[PDB]
Amino acid sequence: NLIETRCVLNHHSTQETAIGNFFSRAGLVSIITMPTTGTQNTDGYVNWDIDLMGYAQLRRKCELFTYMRFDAEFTFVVAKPNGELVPQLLQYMYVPPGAPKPTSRDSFAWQTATNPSVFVKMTDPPAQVSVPFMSPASAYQWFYDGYPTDLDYGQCPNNMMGTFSIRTVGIEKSPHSITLRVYMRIKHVRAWIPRPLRNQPYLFKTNPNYKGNDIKCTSTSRDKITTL
Amino acid sequence: NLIETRCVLNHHSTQETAIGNFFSRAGLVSIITMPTTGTQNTDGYVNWDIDLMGYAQLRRKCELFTYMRFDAEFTFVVAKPNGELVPQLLQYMYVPPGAPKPTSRDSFAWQTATNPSVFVKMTDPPAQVSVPFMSPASAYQWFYDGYPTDLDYGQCPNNMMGTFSIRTVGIEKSPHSITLRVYMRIKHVRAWIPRPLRNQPYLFKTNPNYKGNDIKCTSTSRDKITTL
Amino acid sequence: GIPTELKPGTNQFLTTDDGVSAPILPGFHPTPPIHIPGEVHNLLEICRVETILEVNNLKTNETTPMQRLCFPVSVQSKTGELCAAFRADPGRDGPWQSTILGQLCRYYTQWSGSLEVTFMFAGSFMATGKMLIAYTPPGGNVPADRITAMLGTHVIWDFGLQSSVTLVVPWISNTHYRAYFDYYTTGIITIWYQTNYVVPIGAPTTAYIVALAAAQDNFTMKLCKDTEDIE
Amino acid sequence: GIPTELKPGTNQFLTTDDGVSAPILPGFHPTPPIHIPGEVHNLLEICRVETILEVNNLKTNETTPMQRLCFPVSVQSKTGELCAAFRADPGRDGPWQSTILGQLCRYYTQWSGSLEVTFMFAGSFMATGKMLIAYTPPGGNVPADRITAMLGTHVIWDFGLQSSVTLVVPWISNTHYRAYFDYYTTGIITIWYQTNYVVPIGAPTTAYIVALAAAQDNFTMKLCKDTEDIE
Amino acid sequence: GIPTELKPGTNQFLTTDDGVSAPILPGFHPTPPIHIPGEVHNLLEICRV
Amino acid sequence: ACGYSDRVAQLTIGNSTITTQEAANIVIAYGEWPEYCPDTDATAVDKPTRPDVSVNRFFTLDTKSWAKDSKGWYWKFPDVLTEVGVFGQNAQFHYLYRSGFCVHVQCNASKFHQGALLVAVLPEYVLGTIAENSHPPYATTQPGQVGAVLTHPYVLDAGIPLSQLTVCPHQWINLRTNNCATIIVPYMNTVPFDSALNHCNFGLLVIPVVPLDFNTGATSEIPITVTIAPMCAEFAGLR
């Protein structure tokens, strides 16, 4: 509707609009499930590449800028598929960029001291960690108009943020099915170069391809330029 | 490969290369398992000599130096063989060098006040402790070109760091099978005399013997001195 | 052993709690920053940037979208006839959805301040004529005709003299609620043909205007909320 | 009873958290330190130390490895013919794997700075001759022949005057990633026979050169990671 | 509510940890000391004998 | 920027001159001026090459004809000049590159023509196909001198509204008034020196928001000439 009543006669706080508060708040970026046995769990481990272009809502927000630098905070919510918590010991290993990722439920990859791991019981309150600005360049960039050497067009490897190796501790397999929600919160934000906002459904994580057969108009349509 | 793209034009922080940060980070040095009954557990106790030359990765790093001094920190991760945690009470006794080690599941050795013990439930978060520089000499040494008195050649007893006596509390045996991972982290590091890095597979914990039948070349080979 | 008691809240994870998690890599030194032009500090810096208004948002336009960025004026039009109209409803569906501003509102709940709508004539440098831009305040009645609109806040625009002209909406306010309705206090804008479109022999009898808007320094916003712009 | 609330993270063991564990032996006084020469404070102190490059890494050499530390030059070689070549890829497989530097790179991810490669002639004090050391920058084309290399950065080495000579690689960079590939920006080195190898009657017609490298004061490294040098 | 996180070690009893246990009898005043000859401060005092 | 009623000038640089009208209405990208790269360890043992020879002059690209149906054009920098003059062989034989720009756009039309051209610059101008996966070709991703034509100008061939491109250093050309634009562009990257061949720091766009109109009998194609001038262009050899 449009109830033209109750007019706000007081200016609002500029803090609200500040990039800091715009890109604050923890948010779900990934959901991993390690049930006992079915399709992809006769293993007992998971390798999750820290991916931000996971949920379009977050992504479209970032894409508003060309280059962005920031620290991140991760929190691990874990419980069985039905919300129940059991006394199961877990291990989350952080595999830094350009570092060997577990391939087996017991790869030596899990013992490497340089790959920092965090231990926590399922009953323990959520595990929290802060992962810095791993990029080799002065800032992350959502766009790279060049080539890093074509199928590898626009791919910038200077953005790789690392991987998270989850799994249950113990020689044997875990008797429980797990499903953990990964929350991420950007700290210390800085953005440069503001660019036009997305106006076409996203079709790929790596590029800005759009369904050219169906190009949608940014604003709804009406009958006449005067019907209002 | 060799993608000659993305050149790093900024010098990196010298802190990285500092011996402190090189030899930092906790790491798995030992894994003990005390299942209920099978081969070596009709006992119910374990004596682990604090051994650093356990994992070649750590060892090869140290061997880079002749003498080294440092404080250590130990953390005990315990759970059943399958990752489950139960309300089982544990006792870890530190048997200092030149001190009587338990031989039975109930040796008076476990009561001796001078052998500091730490108590903790399996549900309790991991137990952590710091063990100093126990050496009688000004520093530990990975090499001793002499004799301590030949089968005892190169053996330096001034390096003995102590033993850890693990076991479950209670007159009776524990109904649960245990498997605890021992992590160690070197604090306050100081190194002297840097020596050539290892280039032959390790064959013994106590010496630098190498398979003389198969001596491996430090660097891969190629066809011509000009094929590049 | 310092005497302490755990109070309610202990062990909870509040997706909006500002605390410090441990550093995953303490020995690491992040690639130091450098200088890069165009740094942004507050979204408003962007909202003050004029963007194109899709005033010609006709269902007939969806297949040839470019057309929606501008609207036409011709000789055929008689003096005093309405050219176009649209309310100043940034956060609401319509023309504004194409502007950077109209968009960034969807990411917030409340907001208020002044806006400035600009009109730029692009016809041939040989044509003349006047247009009557008129603002109809919130709660006001929409102009009946050119004369009833001349008595309200307006601006006679001789595009024969200025190829561009700016109007300023004095104030608007939105207080978003659900039931979905907008406590949007906004006015309307009307373009009237003060005089007929005049052109000599050799010049196009149909020209175009591009409309652009943006917030003024007193425009603000509060309370974030994920938009309903994507799927 | 001080009011406190346990925040997320409570009870976790982060293999990289820098805290204080209790002293297992509080009444103990560690054997006090003494002074010992050769204390090391930063690995770089070691990387600035030249070590032998295995430029003669031939499959044919693996059974008589010593041979890999030096390469030969003889009269048979004609003037202008290539003697040897190898890129400045410290952290990468090849000749450098024998140097203290080439090794310590494997224990890190990124790195960059200047390197200095040295060449020491060992033939008999009666021989003369010139060699053309040439550096081919990153992304550059490998010298076609002695003349096309003389136009690039080089150094004519009369070992009849200096039994040793040093070249300096200006800069190199490695940014390690997986997919395993190296964002290694490195140049190449070529040794050309400027003049034929000259010797009088009584002196060996085949001499040897030993190559040695090391980082210069501006070489750095970051991000540790256990090597793949052992098994 | 002061934000705190329990680090490894929490709940352990280290037979060699020097802490303060609560006073079982806070209102009690121990029989004050007096002077007695032959006080010993360091075993070595005895080893020199 | 430049329009009717402005004293005609004659700017000369090197062995080249353009008769452009002096109009103190130039666009300065993100409020910055093109300068000489701040000290970075790479150019400390390898000083940067700054050819002021035949690299600092006025490059004029082949004019483009503007017809009633033209959809737009675009150019990638530095790709556009990579094949042109010493700016090419210099940018090629030298690994690293860094430079700012004076970008001049100019129409030539009668006072009986009408049209509106938007002219903006866009850092990291990545493009996307119509799709299934398929990264754009190499001929349209890095068009070079000739440039490429826009196919879907409404979303800018990148799924993003044209209606919002003014959030970038833009400049309007409204025949009815001015007839030429000018833009100062400062180097923009995440590193001081990048690769002059692989990466294109930004793209130049010339889109006709308001189509070109005239009454038949008048020139049917309007020329759009673009002149480019490098500002403080350095190159790192690393040898």
Kind and range of the H or E element at D45?
helix D44-47
Instruction: For residues F83 and F59, give the distance between their C-alpha atoms in angstroms, rounded to a whole number.
Output: 12
Q: Identify the CA nearest to F204 among candidates F43, F89, F45, F73.
A: F73
Chain D residues with CB under 8 Å of C13 CB are 8
Domain F1-239, CATH among 2.60.120.20, 3.30.70.120, 2.10.109.10, 3.40.50.300: 2.60.120.20
Q: Which of D3, D16, D18 sits opposite C5 (nearest CB)?
A: D3
Among D136, D137, D171, beta carbon nearest to F42: D171
C-alpha B129/C-alpha B50 separation (Å) is 13
Query: Taking CB atoms and an 8 Å cutoff, what residues of chain B touch F238?
Result: 7
Cα(D58)–Cα(D70) distance, rounded to whole angstroms?
A: 11
Widest CA span of chain F, in angstroms?
64
Total residue count of chain B as it appears in this document: 228
| Separation CA C92–CA C182 (nearest Å) | 8
CB F207 within 8 A of CB F148: no
Chain C residues with CB under 8 Å of F37 CB are: none
Q: How far apart are CA D127 and CA F230, in angstroms?
A: 54
Cα distance between residue D214 and residue D227, in whole Å:
19
Q: Count the Cβ atoms, other than its own, within 10 Å of residue B44.
A: 19
Cβ contact B–C (≥3 pairs, < 8 Å): yes
Closest CB from E3, E4, E19 relative to C1: E19
Neighbour count for residue D155 (Cβ, 10 Å): 14
Residue of E nearest to C3 (CA): E22
Query: Hey, is A57 helix, strand or coil?
Result: helix
Beta strand spans in chain F (E): 2-3, 11-13, 16-18, 27-28, 59-66, 73-77, 96-107, 114-123, 148-149, 170-174, 178-185, 194-195, 202-213, 222-236
End-to-end CA distance of chain F: 43
Listed by the residue before each break, gaps in chain A with C–N over 2.5 Å are 149
> Cis omega before residue F230 (within 30°)?
no
Element (H, E) at A140: strand A140-141
Closest among F81, F20, F65, F37 to F233, alpha carbons compared: F37
Q: What's the CATH code of the domain at D229?
A: 2.60.120.20
Q: Which of B5, B6, B9 sits opposite F192 (nearest CB)?
A: B9
Q: How was this structure determined?
A: X-ray
Best of B7, B8, B12 to disrupt the F interface by mutation (most F CBs within 10 Å)? B7
Burial of B137: CB neighbours in 10 Å, binned 0-12, 13-18, 19+: middle
Domain extent at residue C56: 1-231
* Chain B neighbors of F95, CB-CB under 8 A: 7
* Residues B125, A196: Cα–Cα separation, whole Å: 50
Q: Which residue of B has its CA nearest to F45?
A: B9
Q: How many domains does one find in chain C?
A: 1
Tell me whether F129 touches chain A (CB under 8 Å). Answer: yes
User: A interface toward B at CB cutoff 8 Å?
Assistant: 86-90, 111-114, 116, 119, 121, 123-124, 136-137, 148-149, 157-158, 168-175
* Closest-CA residue of chain E to C12: E3
Q: Which residue has the tokens 């520093």?
A: B139
Q: Which residue of F has its CA nearest to B7?
A: F194
Cα-based distances in Å from F220 to B6, F210, F214: 47, 16, 8
Residues in CB range of A61: below 8 A, 6 or more apart = A22, A23, C107
Q: How far apart are CA B148 and CA B157, in angstroms?
A: 8
The two three-digit tokens of residue B1, written as one number: 């490969």
User: What one-letter code names the amino acid at F197?
Assistant: L
**What CA–CA distance (Å, rounded) separates B69 from B188?**
8
Hey, are the CB atoms on B120 and E7 less than 8 Å from each other? no
**Binding-face residues of B in 3-22 toward C, CB within 8 A:** 10, 12-13, 15-16, 21
Q: What is the 3-state secondary structure (H, E, C) of chain B?
A: CCCCCCCCCCCCCHHHHEHHHHCCCCEEEEEEEECCCCCCCCCCEEEEECCCCCCHHHHHHHCCEEEEEEEEEEEEEEECCCCECCCCEEEEEEECCCCCCCCCCCCHHHCCCCCCEEEEECCCCCEEEEECCCCCCCCEECCCCCCCCCCCCCCCHHHCCCEEEEEECCCCCCCCCEEEEEEEEEEEEEEEEECCCCCCCCCCCCCCCCCCCCCCCCCCCECCCCCC
Contact B90, B179 (CB under 8 A): no
- Report the C-alpha gap between F181 and F26 in whole angstroms: 7
Residues of B within 8 A of F47 (CB-CB) are: none
Rounded CA-CA distance F164/C103 in Å is 10
What single-letter amino acid sits at C10?
T
Distance CA(B174)–CA(B169), nearest Å, equals 8
Contact D90, D182 (CB under 8 A): no
Which tokens is D103 given? 């090794």
Minimum Cα–Cα distance from C27: chain B residue: B21
Neighbours of F101 (CB within 10 A): 25
**For chain B, which chains pass the contact test of at least 3 CB pairs under 8 Å?**
A, C, D, E, F
From the list B65, B125, B183, the residue facing D11 with the nearest CB is B125
Cross-chain residue pair C52–F29, CB shorter than 8 Å: no
Mutation target for A interface from C6, C12, C34, C43: give the one with most A CBs within 10 A: C43
Domain ranges of chain F: 1-239
- List beta partners, residue B2: none
Interface membership of F29 toward A (CB under 8 Å): no
Indicate the helix (H) or strand (E) that contains C45: helix C44-47
Domains of chain B: residue spans and CATH? 1-228 (2.60.120.20)
**Dihedral of CA E20/E26/E28/E29: which sign?**
positive
Q: Which residues of F touch D152 (CB under 8 A)?
A: 239
In whole angstroms, what is the distance from residue F171 CA to residue D207 CA? 70
Size of interface D-E (CB pairs under 8 A): 41
- The residue with tokens 């003060």 is C194
Q: Are D and F close enough to touch, i.e. 3+ CB pairs under 8 angstroms?
A: yes
Query: Which residue in the set B25, B197, B219 is minimally distant from D95, CB to CB?
Result: B219
Q: Are strands B89-95 and B163-168 parallel, antiparallel or unpaired?
A: antiparallel
What is the distance between the alpha carbons of residues D8 and E3, in angstroms, rounded to a whole number? 10
Grouping H, G, I as helix, E, B as strand and the rest as coil, residue D98 is helix
DSSP D149-212: HHTSSEEEEETTT-SEEEEEEEEEEE-EE---EE--B--EEEEEESS--B--TTS-SEEEEEEE
Tracing tokens 């609207």 back to the chain, one arrives at: C71
- Quick check: A159 and A140 in contact, CB under 8 A? yes
Q: φ and ψ at D48, to 5 degrees?
A: -85, 0
d(CA F93, CA F87): 10
Q: Does any CB of chain D come closer than 8 Å to the CB of residue E14? A: yes
- Token pair for residue A55? 């949920």
Q: Subunits with at least 3 CB pairs below 8 A relative to chain C? A: A, B, D, E, F
**Chain F residue at shortest CA distance from D168:** F239
Q: Do C17 and D2 touch (CB under 8 A)?
A: no
- Tell me the chain A residues in contact with residue B125 when contact means C-beta distances shorter than 8 Å: 121, 124
In one letter, which amino acid is E16?
A: T
Interface probe, candidates D42, D70, D97, D190, chain B, greatest B C-beta count within 10 A: D42
Nearest to B97 by CA among B140, B45, B142: B140
> Which has the closest alpha carbon to C193: C151, C159, C224?
C159
Rounded Cα gap, residues D177 and D172, in angstroms: 16
Tell if the CB–CB gap between C9 and E1 is shorter than 8 Å. Answer: yes
Task: Measure B188 CA to nearest chain C CA, in Å.
Answer: 15
